[PDB]
Amino acid sequence: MAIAHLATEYVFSDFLGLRLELAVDKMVTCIAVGLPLLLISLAFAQEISIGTQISCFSPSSFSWAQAAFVDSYCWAAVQQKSSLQSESGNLPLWLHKFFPYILLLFAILLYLPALFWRFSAAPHLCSDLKFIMEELDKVYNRAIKAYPIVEQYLKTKKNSSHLIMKYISCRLVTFVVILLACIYLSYYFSLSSLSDEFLCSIKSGVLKNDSTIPDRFQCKLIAVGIFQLLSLINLIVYALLIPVVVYTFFIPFRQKTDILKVYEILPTFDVLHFKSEGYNDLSLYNLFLEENISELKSYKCLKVLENIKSPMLLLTNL
Amino acid sequence: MAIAHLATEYVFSDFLGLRLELAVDKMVTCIAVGLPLLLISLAFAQEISIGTQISCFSPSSFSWAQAAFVDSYCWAAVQQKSSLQSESGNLPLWLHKFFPYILLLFAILLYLPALFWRFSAAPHLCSDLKFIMEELDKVYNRAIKAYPIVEQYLKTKKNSSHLIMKYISCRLVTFVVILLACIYLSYYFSLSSLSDEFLCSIKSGVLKNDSTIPDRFQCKLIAVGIFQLLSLINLIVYALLIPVVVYTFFIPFRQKTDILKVYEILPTFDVLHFKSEGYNDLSLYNLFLEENISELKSYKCLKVLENIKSPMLLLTNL
Amino acid sequence: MAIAHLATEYVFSDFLGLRLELAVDKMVTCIAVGLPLLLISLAFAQEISIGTQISCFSPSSFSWAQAAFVDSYCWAAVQQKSSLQSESGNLPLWLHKFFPYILLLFAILLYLPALFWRFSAAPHLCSDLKFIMEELDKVYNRAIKAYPIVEQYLKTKKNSSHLIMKYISCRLVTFVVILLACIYLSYYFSLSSLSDEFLCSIKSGVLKNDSTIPDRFQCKLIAVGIFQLLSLINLIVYALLIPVVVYTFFIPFRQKTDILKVYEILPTFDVLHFKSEGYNDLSLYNLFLEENISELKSYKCLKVLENIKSPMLLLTNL
Amino acid sequence: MAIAHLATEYVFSDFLGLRLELAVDKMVTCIAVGLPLLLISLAFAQEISIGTQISCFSPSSFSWAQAAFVDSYCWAAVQQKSSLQSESGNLPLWLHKFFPYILLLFAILLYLPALFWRFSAAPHLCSDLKFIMEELDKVYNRAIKAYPIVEQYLKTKKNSSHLIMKYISCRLVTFVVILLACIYLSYYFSLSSLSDEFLCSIKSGVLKNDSTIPDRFQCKLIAVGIFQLLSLINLIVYALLIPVVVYTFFIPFRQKTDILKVYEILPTFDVLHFKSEGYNDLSLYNLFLEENISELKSYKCLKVLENIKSPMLLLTNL
Amino acid sequence: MAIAHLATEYVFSDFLGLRLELAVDKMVTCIAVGLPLLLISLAFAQEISIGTQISCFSPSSFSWAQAAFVDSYCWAAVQQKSSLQSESGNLPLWLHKFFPYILLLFAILLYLPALFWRFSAAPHLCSDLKFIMEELDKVYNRAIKAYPIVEQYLKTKKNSSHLIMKYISCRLVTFVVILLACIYLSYYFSLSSLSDEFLCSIKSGVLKNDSTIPDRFQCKLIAVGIFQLLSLINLIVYALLIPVVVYTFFIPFRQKTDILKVYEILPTFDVLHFKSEGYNDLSLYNLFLEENISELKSYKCLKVLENIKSPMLLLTNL
Amino acid sequence: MAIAHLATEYVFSDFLGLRLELAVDKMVTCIAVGLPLLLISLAFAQEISIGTQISCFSPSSFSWAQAAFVDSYCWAAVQQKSSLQSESGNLPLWLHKFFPYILLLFAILLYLPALFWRFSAAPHLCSDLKFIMEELDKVYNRAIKAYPIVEQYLKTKKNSSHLIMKYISCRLVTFVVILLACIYLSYYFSLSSLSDEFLCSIKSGVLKNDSTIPDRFQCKLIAVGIFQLLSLINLIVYALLIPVVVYTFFIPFRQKTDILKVYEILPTFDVLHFKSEGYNDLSLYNLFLEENISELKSYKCLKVLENIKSPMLLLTNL
Asked: Which cysteines share a disulfide bond (chains A, B, C, D, E, F)?
């Protein structure tokens, strides 16, 4: 398995029939969530993890048992206010210990907006795309055979901003969490490397009077050199996601082609060039249609005709 | 696997054809049960668990065997009244040792109300939704073709409070267990961190007279720093679930739309605007219908007509 | 996996098309068998199991090899009459060692009555429910179209007590084993905690004359603190099962509804209100029917009519 | 997994469409083979197995390497005639070491008779039951419509003792192996517990002259206390199987009901009350029929009629 | 898993639609190959394997590192001519080390003849049985309706010895390998048990002049006591296979019944009582037919008639 | 699992609907690739691998840490020119260390020619066999009913040498790699066994002046005794493959039967006895046909007729 298992599991697999999520939003989500899980898995892979997260230089007179006590006591001490000293103050010692949980927190907080979309909006969308697609097939079938119900339905969706507010807020939560992650990772990468070293003391309680124990044990958080390097990789990738997520808000500019023009070739259709530059749900339906209706037989036939036209009897010989 | 396995297993998977549980109740249950299982799994993950739960500072004259005896004897001693001293009293030492079992107890106690619902109420519900849905399809088919059995059936369900009392009590047990968990976790997080340190003594029995053994061994429960931190995460999330669970009791306010109005467009139907503001089973059926009948072809057709109307021949050209 | 695996395996899964076991008997069996298997799995989970079950305080002059001999010799000695002393006598040391096997014994002994039912009675039942259900569908079909073979068959089952004696004895064996478990667990929980400590001696045979070996080694069964706590959980749950199992014997009182009255609406049926208050197999068939025939289309139709009646042409418009 | 895995694997699962083995013979075989495999799995489960099977008290002057040599040399020595002493003689030391293989031997030797039946007799049987069952359905179909080939075939099977001699010998081999196991386990349980202790000596060859090595090392087979206890469980269960296996030989008494009487109700059948009290293959066919033909639709119909009779037009209204 | 896993994997499972191998040859092959694989798996099972295959008694002055060097150097030395002494000579030390590979060699060499049969002969056979079986069904269908192509085909196969020479040679290779295994195992079991002990010397090269190192280290191959015992089990079983394999050569005597006589009842068939006592391929086809054509509906019908006869209109009422 | 797993995985399984590879070439490839993978798996199986690949005799004054440094430093040193001495020179120490990679290299280099055939030639072949087979079925169907397109197609394939040059070159690469492997393994088996011993020195850098460190450490590559033995097994098997691979080049001699003669019985066919003794693709098609068309119903019928003939109305009664 080694490292190479992790590539098969988190890179070569979609580890997370209509497309109810746009490809950009799927890739943004899969990168944003999948990367920190990979980085955590690498940071502790036995190819690079030598052993314990901590070690401390106990005096040579200590038994092996007393040395194991010092190591494990000081691993507990890193989060206890009195039994420490470091010139950085105690704060970075928390981050060095809890680094994998903090990345896991960002991984989950970046997943929740997509999970909310899957449950709050996808089923409310799925019904209506299926309706619109089947009605468009009737419009095509009628033209080959040769009421405006779907046109009146879409004209009604133009008078609404319910789903688009769910979508924008889902994107906006993802944006904020990515920005906060970039701020955190920039700070954590700024920690001076020697803040992985700190002075411990076991002289709490009964041991406080024992003259055979030194007043300080020097300890090192061996893994910190890995975490800081991997935090820079994470910071770079998220700094690239930021402008992509911002681009997702520009819905009325994201509509690539006015596909309904391909049906507006037909006399059975209507001038539904309804590029709503106001943020209205119909504009978001257009994006989901442009993602899905490439599957439609009618679209394929009419787009071929449109591309060649760039004559209805031709449809009979297709 | 590492930490990242746990995300795939407990976050990215529904690890727990009609929907017989409401989406809010499924998410509340899946969070309430799934979170402590994740937190237990994290608290002992080898990325953060250094080793043994305890260590004790045996004298340097002790053999490695005698030191391993002290560690393991004191791990047993934490729950034995005489062989301990701590300024906190003995009580917190129990909680520090048994922390994973106590979270597991809350996980199970939060699952049982949903398991009871699955067995006590779901099959008694499943038959009746299927009946109601199929009869509504007849009402729609009759209107396209153009006895009040389902109307009389629903009118009879209005005269009952059997299933709603099962539902409310199921919710109420979940509420109480969540509140008790929040009380416990608030206390456990309030324990002073140095209560992870205690004084042990092996001088029971034969050892009582041995002058070579010190009267106290200082011991530390190394994991306690993790448990207290993770208890705060658990407390925060459950403190957010509390108001959501309370909201579930407001059944007559939870009905979002009077969907039967969409069928009351038809002359074949009746004025079943039976928003029972009394807690009557029909009101709970309305919630389960609003969860399920979005799947009905008749609803889809009539809701499109209703939305456009916001003419029966139109149904022939759909 | 950790602890949380055990919840997925033994709580969230039915780890054990007609329903040939009543839901109460399935839940009683699944709790009675499933709980001790979970408790065994917890008691040795590495989240709480520190290491070896025993440790002994060998003198500081002993090599690591001699100390490992003392530990392992005394683990054997706990069941050997001469090489021990404890103020409790030797008996509790057996129970402390063999605790997981004793729980496993109760787990199996509680499963066997259900396994016997599956093989001795379920196939003899399965044929006859299928017969009765299909004949009741004929009675319903005949009434819609508008010999007493099934009525005469059921009237004959009233003259028998074969299957009910199998059922009662199956329940009675489960009752006895649960009561014996409660007695045992009450005793084992009553053992004074310091009975986990005992005095060992290796001075058998050749070692008997060696003045360098101490006459007693103090040893502790580190796990005993877990077993006693978990035995209280097991005792509490089984003490709740006892009255539920007792309730199962009251077969003629357990019949919730006289469902055949719903068919006795029809003129094609007969007055089979045969609530046998004598313990006769027909009464047990009624319970299995009330568990199964909620699946019947005829029952669903006629129960809707019965509920509304609380007219045969109405059946034509269903 | 722990202990509880073993319950799921060997108790709650049939780990070993006609029924070609009688239910009694399947249960006898599954207990006889399945129990020792479970007992072996328990005896070495890490919940009770502390560690190595042997330990020896090497002098304190020995290095850890020399002590590990003594332990492993003496584990080899238990089966070597000269390098041992025990007051029991050497024999029980073999049994204590090889205990799991000896149970495995009994497990396999008890399986082979069932494996022989599956290959030597089951396919020779399977054809003929299918023939007999289908011909009986013709007899029933003919009576509803209203040559003795199957009657003449069964009358010919009465003149044979081929299959019954295979069956009896299969049962007899199982009986003998169970009895030999009970004899062995009774002996092994009779071994005095201190026969787990023996005196080893490494002074073979070059070491023979070394005055620094003691003439005897005391050793203990730590696991023997488990094996003796588990042997008593195995002995008890097999002592219960013995009378059940003996009962299987009484084939002409095992026929519970003269099921062909249910077909002898029909005028199309014949007086095949052929309860052969001589050990003739037809009598064994009767047992396999009584195991299988409860599946036949004809039997179900005619048994209902027979039970009510306890009229052929009635068959038309079933 | 333990030992009991191995029973499930190699005894209770066929771990290796026409039957293209005779049942005797399948069982011989499955025993011959499957047994040594089981014995290897047992010989190193952790229930009996204590640890390392070797240990050597290094002087007490040696560090743990130097002792581990002696053990591992001598494990290499067992196959090096100069750095050894044993009164047996060096030869048995090879066999003791390489015992599992030598059994694996016999396992593979016993499998290859069956693998050759599967590829060299089974597809050349499979076509012709299917042909013969279907033509025999025509002969039966013609008799019920009431050219000798299949008879002329079988009469031609009588004039050939191609497939029988493949079969005999396949059996003969299996015989030779089994006999050689029995010779080897008899020798290996004859090795005096103390040949597991040998004298090693590390004084090669630079160490040759070091006066602190003893001239010989005594070493023991701890596992040899297991291998010799298991070799006797293997020898016994293979000594039972030898006469069974020899019996397989007697093809013209192995034909149990002249099944074509059952078809020679029909006037549409011919006197194909072609029991070739010369070793001719048709005789081998008879064995494969007697293995397969028990599946034929025609055979079942005609054998019932033959058994009763021990009239063609009777076939119409079957 | 042990050794026996490896037999199930690499011997009893085809671990690598037309047959697009000839059976000889499949077996040659499966042996050539499968054997070294098995041998690698054996050479490190824990049944024979004692532990570390190296050990070195550090002085008794060294701490366990310093000894582990010497072992691991010298494992690195075996491939570093200055920090070694051996009378063999440094070269064999590379081969002893990298032995498993070198076998893996041969395993892959022997697989690539078959992988190239699967992608470069198999799909270009697959279409044309399907064409030829279906056209031959027309020729047979026409004769039963009673243009030379397939004959003209095959006559055109005679005028080509495209596919045969791909095939020969694929075989030739396999031949060369097998011969180079035999040369390498012969050399590696010729290495004097004591070349597993070498003199290391840690006195690089800072240690160069330390008088407490000896100038040489003797080290041994413990595994080398296994590798040399297993290399002889590999050499023997590949020396047997060499003449088989050479035989594959004799394509015009490998054609076993002139199967088209069986169709040339028909008047609808033509004298396609086109045994091209020139290396022309049609000759290679003949081999693939002789591998595949034994599946054809037409071939089976006509070969039966041909064998009996060794009359066309006979085909009507088949």
From this structure: 56-219, 74-200
Confirm if C167 and C284 have CB atoms less than 8 A apart.
Answer: yes
**What residues have CB less than 8 Å from B24, skipping those under 6 apart?**
B244, B247, B248
Distance from CA of A264 to the nearest CA of B (A): 19
- Which H or E element spans position D273? none
Of the candidates F170, F164, F171, F166, the one whose C-alpha atom is nearest the C-alpha of residue F248 is F171
Q: How far apart are CA D76 and CA D56, in angstroms?
A: 13
Contacts of E143 (CB under 8 A, 6+ apart): E266, E267, E268, E312, E315
* Helices vs strands, H then E, count in chain E: 12, 4
| Half-sphere exposure (Cβ direction) of F91: Cα atoms closer than 13 Å | 6
CA-wise closest residue to E227 among E131, E123, E95? E95
Experimental method of this PDB entry: cryo-EM
Count CB neighbours of B59 within 10 A.
Answer: 18
Strand stretches in E155-231, DSSP E: 197-200, 217-221
Strand partners, C221: C54
Alpha helices in chain F (DSSP H): 2-10, 23-43, 64-77, 91-120, 122-145, 149-157, 162-190, 224-248, 251-254, 260-263, 281-292, 297-309
- Give the resolution to one decimal, in Å: 2.9
CA distance B117 to B123: 9
Instruction: List, in order, residues 6 or more apart from A139 with CB less than 8 Å away.
Output: A150, A263, A266, A268, A269, A298
DSSP state of A278: S
Contacts of F45 in chain E (CB under 8 A): 100
Residues of A in contact with B222 (CB under 8 A): 72-73, 75-76
Number of Cβ within 10 Å of residue A157's Cβ equals: 21
E53: number of Cβ within 10 Å: 24
Q: How far is E155 from chain D (nearest CA, A)?
A: 29
CA angle F310, F313, F318 (to 5 degrees): 75
- The size of chain C, in residues, is 318
Distance separating alpha carbons of residues A286 and A292, to the nearest angstrom: 10
Tokens read off for E95: 């066999």
Taking CB atoms and an 8 Å limit, are D3 and C204 in contact across chains? Answer: no
Give the tokens for residue E264.
């020679």
Total Cβ atoms within 10 A of residue A89: 10
User: What six digits make up the tokens of B271?
Assistant: 């004025």
CB of C153 closer than 8 Å to CB of D308: yes
Which uninterrupted H or E stretch holds D201? Answer: none
Q: How far is C256 from chain D (nearest CA, A)?
A: 28
Q: Does C225 touch chain B (CB under 8 A)?
A: yes
Cβ neighbors of F20 (< 8 A, separation 6 or more) are F118, F122, F125, F126, F288
Interface of B with C in 106-135 (CB under 8 A): 107-108, 111, 119, 123, 127, 131, 135
Alpha-carbon distance values, D76 to E60, E87, E220, E225, E227 (Å)? 22, 20, 9, 6, 12
With H, G, I as helix, E, B as strand and everything else as coil, classify residue A217: strand
E220·D73 Cβ contact <8 A: yes
The Cβ of residue F35 has, within 10 Å, a number of other Cβ atoms equal to 21
Going from the C-alpha of B216 to that of each of B86, B222, C54, C198, C275, the distances in angstroms are 12, 18, 21, 21, 73
* Cα angle for residues B262, B263, B266 (degrees, 5° grid): 115
List, in order, residues 6 or more apart from A315 with CB less than 8 Å away.
Answer: A143, A144, A301, A305
Q: Alpha-carbon distance F274 to D112, whole Å?
A: 58
Closest CA to F113 of F36, F180, F32, F183: F32
By C-alpha distance, which of C25, C6, C43 is closest to C188? Answer: C43
**Which helix or strand (DSSP H or E) is residue B236 part of?**
helix B224-248
